[PDB]
């Protein structure tokens, strides 16, 4: 039962705002896992499970999205320690995060960007269907299962329960945050998510994010540093509309002409990753 004996702990994978994440093996069946540690004194957002156990919001959100299969890294188990929580997460093998993938490969071919973006849209729709807003969609928070061609969302540590009312708090990545957050410290969940997805799609087809500075985020000018089809530019500029009400719904994104004839995950792996 105790964590000590139920998992074999490997080396660090990374640390930051999220916590400290180790490679691990589940002893009962040698399943590859990621073991994430969060210090209680560092957790600002707390929630309750059905039975009213006080847990990090991150555990609440992970449990809501971890039921059945999806493009989200699943919570397999969690433990409370005197000063921390430990989360046992899926670990695809082999894996690379989309940030490192884009650094190494440069601007992705539109066929590959389409497949990746489509899978991120399906994963984000899954979160919203489960009542969860991620609030930190970025290449760093997307893992690629290189053999299956499957993308997995990670790090719900900045997330919230999805609501239809205004958010006045944010702890996600500023360079993916929308102009209404920069200007007014207010945003709505879905329209802010669509803005972050515009930033991500630009990142995929151009090889880096469009904006570094607050003035660029609010300025409303998207300069293409790479060759990008007119249909793809149109979708990006629509996702990055300054007025939230001018942004597409998830339905309008997936019905966009640029998004049609997506590769299956296995086709994506065979053509672009193998």
């Amino acid at each position: 039962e105790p964590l000590e004996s139920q998992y074999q702990v490997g080396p660090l994978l990374g640390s930051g705002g999220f916590g400290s994440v180790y490679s691990g093996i589940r002893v009962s069946d040698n399943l590859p896992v990621a073991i994430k540690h969060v210090e209680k004194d560092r957790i600002s957002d707390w929630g309750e499970l059905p039975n009213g156990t006080r847990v990090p919001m991150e555990v609440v959100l992970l449990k809501k999205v971890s039921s059945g299969f999806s493009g989200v890294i699943r919570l397999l188990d969690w433990f409370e320690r005197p000063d921390s929580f430990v989360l046992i997460l899926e670990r695809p093998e082999p894996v690379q995060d989309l940030f490192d993938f884009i650094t190494e490969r440069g601007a992705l071919q539109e066929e590959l960007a389409r497949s990746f973006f489509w899978q991120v849209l399906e994963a984000v729709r899954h979160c919203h269907n489960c009542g969860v807003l991620h609030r930190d969609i970025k290449d760093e928070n997307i893992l690629i299962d290189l053999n299956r061609g499957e993308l997995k969302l990670i790090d719900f540590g900045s997330g919230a329960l999805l609501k239809d009312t205004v958010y006045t708090d944010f702890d996600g990545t500023r360079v993916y945050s929308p102009p209404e957050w920069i200007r007014y410290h207010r945003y709505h969940g879905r329209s802010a998510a669509v803005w972050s997805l515009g930033i991500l799609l630009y990142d995929m087809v151009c090889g880096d994010i469009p904006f570094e500075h607050d003035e660029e985020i609010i300025g409303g000018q998207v300069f293409f540093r790479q060759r990008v089809s007119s249909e793809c530019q149109h979708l990006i500029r629509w996702c990055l509309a300054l007025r939230p009400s001018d942004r597409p719904t998830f339905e309008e994104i997936q019905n966009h002409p640029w998004m049609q004839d997506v590769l299956l995950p296995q086709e994506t792996a065979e053509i672009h990753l193998h």
């Binding site: 705002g17 760093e140 790090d155 702890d171 360079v175 993916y176 090889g207 880096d208």
Partner: peptide, 10 residues
């Protein structure tokens, strides 16, 4: 040539 970097949450 141009600097690409990660951006911390917060």
């Amino acid at each position: 040539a141009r600097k690409r970097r990660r951006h911390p949450s917060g």
